[PDB]
């Protein structure tokens, strides 16, 4: 189960740019202490991971992380088992995993001085924001409290603090420069097939709107919904009746077309609450965001597109996460994405 | 095929680190976004490991360790895009572990609700940053001279400069002592192994060791910082231009020194060091004396009966190598003469 024959694996950088201090650079002065006098930078780049199988069959996959995460959450479970990386060079896909940039191996753009700031510039924000272990238990959904399970969970337990050391922060890098090294390395890489995971999810349908190759999306569990500007539906208010979701992402009706031209499934787990849950803000989140993507989905068939909602549950699988990859069903979880890989002809020559 | 790698099995995993907390209790009906110190405990200083591991793996595991700045990138591929060390000791049937140590890479940068690395009224880490620069660190690895610039005969892969450079950055100013934790807790988990360092892992590896004796052997690539039992530090002189002085040496009580006296310790070395002073050149003076420190720290080591040794990569006919060997375009050549120090102490067998 654990095997893999890869005819070629590596990485490199993709994306980016140059910023420069002032000044010149003499060889001939101390390089240490580092300076920004006379420096090129190079910023928010993005790192890029693939594997290869002996004979490949389809359009090659490029898995792409949720916020705060890297490319190890399709390598591996917390628990150790193998992720999509794996599964899916078994099943004969060439694999691409990303670090996007501000993020694991992508670039932190900071220099010499306070963080981010680059001289009088400030390139990303001195102040970061991070979410901690409890909220980001009740954002997974392992339970509805910090360290309390659904009784259903198939969450790989014990292997809590594994899970969380994965996550991180993310400077505050625009999205359109997140979304513009991707767009460059499909279009590096050729027609492929996009797996998003939280949010990364709006950032890929916006690359499928500038990327003709991006032929396919499986978007696990995505965490903002995207309409054509001036067309956003209703969306209620939390169950608190003060909170909201985030905001819909709005685009110009021409680049939203092109999202009917390519099948899109969005996938969710299990224990998001049908009722308002105003005791469980995230659970009651994950409601409301849940609701506005079904009506994403319907803007998009309106236009002419394939876009599909699978809940986990109606598939026969119970209890997961919102991380359904590296849950202990992920095998399972997986067979559901060779399914719609094969339905679409996107594992065929 | 030079390409084609077969695995057993492979994978990734978080090791290491320890948690802070902010103040106050975490109500779950309160909106969790945006996010709040309040009632958070946060993960830090974590180390990321990746492990392949061959069909029938023959003798120690490989655990690389990249230099100040860097990830495991390096040793998964050249910046041309040609195979790494990691490939090329998979192939030679090692299994082999790649580190992002902590504060690079998918290793744990500690920053929370605030100023970057300051939780509430603690400074986990500093706020203000330092990075090297495109051309300072041209001339750290010896690319040429001056940046633009190459030596004769150069391995750099040509025309992949961009590649390169991003590939670096950061580090945030976690204690040395925390990233030394998460290796020797690593070393812990694998049993026996041999660590292949660089630059700025150097020094730390070699406090792995006399912490670790799962340690067995260490190979060092251009190592950055130097290292004495205390008290014990040579005279080293300053740079040309009478001011500069190289990285303060690394001290550490003799008990713990002696450990490096019972492994096999090679450190490696490429090209363009000069023999004499050069005033014009800082880097490539400092990389003169601070080659000349390690050549004294290896001699203290064999004095204390150890088997320490010193290759310049242009004695054993390979010429024109950077700072980083192991990316450069004979690599591969770089790659056998680290499989004949493995296959000389054995460490290639069973
Ligand atoms: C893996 O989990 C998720 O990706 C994920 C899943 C659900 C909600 C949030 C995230 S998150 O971690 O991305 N968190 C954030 O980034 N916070 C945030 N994001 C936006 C866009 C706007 C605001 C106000 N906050
Ligand atoms: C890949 O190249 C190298 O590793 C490498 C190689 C040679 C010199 C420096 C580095 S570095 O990048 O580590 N740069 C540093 O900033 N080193 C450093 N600087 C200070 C001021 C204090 C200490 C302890 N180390």
Redesign the interface.
């Known amino acids: 189960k654990?095997?893999?024959?890869?005819?070629?694996?590596?990485?490199?950088?993709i994306g980016?740019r140059?910023v420069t201090?002032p000044g010149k650079?003499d060889?001939?002065?101390?390089?240490?202490?580092?300076?920004?006098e006379?420096?090129?930078?190079?910023i928010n780049?993005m790192?890029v991971?693939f594997q290869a199988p002996?004979r490949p069959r389809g359009l090659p996959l490029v898995f792409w992380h949720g916020g705060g995460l890297?490319?190890?959450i399709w390598?591996?479970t917390?628990d150790?088992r193998?992720?999509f990386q794996?599964l899916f060079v078994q099943d004969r896909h060439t694999v691409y995993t990303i670090?996007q940039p501000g993020r694991?191996?992508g670039?932190?753009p900071?220099?010499?001085?306070?963080?981010?700031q680059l001289e009088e510039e400030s390139i990303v924000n001195?102040?970061?924001?991070?979410?901690?272990?409890?909220?980001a238990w009740?954002?997974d959904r392992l339970g509805?409290?910090?360290g309390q399970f659904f009784e259903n969970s198939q969450f790989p337990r014990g292997y809590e603090?594994?899970y969380?050391?994965?996550?991180?922060?993310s400077p505050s890098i625009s999205s359109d420069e997140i979304v513009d090294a991707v767009v460059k390395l499909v279009t590096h890489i050729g027609p492929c097939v996009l797996v998003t995971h939280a949010a990364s999810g709006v950032l890929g349908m916006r690359v499928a709107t500038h990327a003709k190759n991006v032929r396919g999306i499986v978007a696990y569990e995505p965490a903002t919904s995207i309409f054509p500007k001036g067309k956003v539906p209703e969306i209620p208010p939390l169950a608190?009746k003060?909170?909201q979701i985030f905001p819909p992402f709005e685009i110009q009706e021409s680049y939203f077309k092109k999202l009917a031209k390519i099948p899109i499934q969005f996938v969710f787990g299990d224990n998001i609450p049908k009722n308002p849950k105003?005791?469980?803000?995230?659970l009651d989140?994950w409601r409301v965001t849940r609701y506005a993507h079904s009506l994403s989905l319907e803007a998009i068939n309106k236009l002419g597109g394939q876009a599909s909602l699978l809940d986990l549950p109606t598939a026969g699988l119970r209890g997961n996460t919102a991380f359904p990859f590296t849950d202990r069903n992920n095998v399972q979880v997986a067979s559901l994405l060779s399914d719609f890989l094969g339905k679409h002809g996107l594992d065929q020559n």
């Open positions: 654990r095997k893999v024959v890869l005819a070629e694996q590596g990485s490199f950088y980016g140059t201090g650079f060889p001939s002065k101390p390089v240490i202490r580092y300076s920004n006379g420096a090129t930078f190079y780049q790192y991971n002996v890297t490319g190890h390598e591996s917390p150790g193998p992720g794996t670090d694991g191996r670039n932190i900071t220099f010499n001085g306070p963080f981010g001195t102040v970061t924001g991070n979410s901690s272990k409890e909220g009740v954002r509805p409290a910090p603090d594994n969380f050391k994965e996550m991180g922060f608190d003060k909170s105003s005791a469980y803000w995230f989140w």
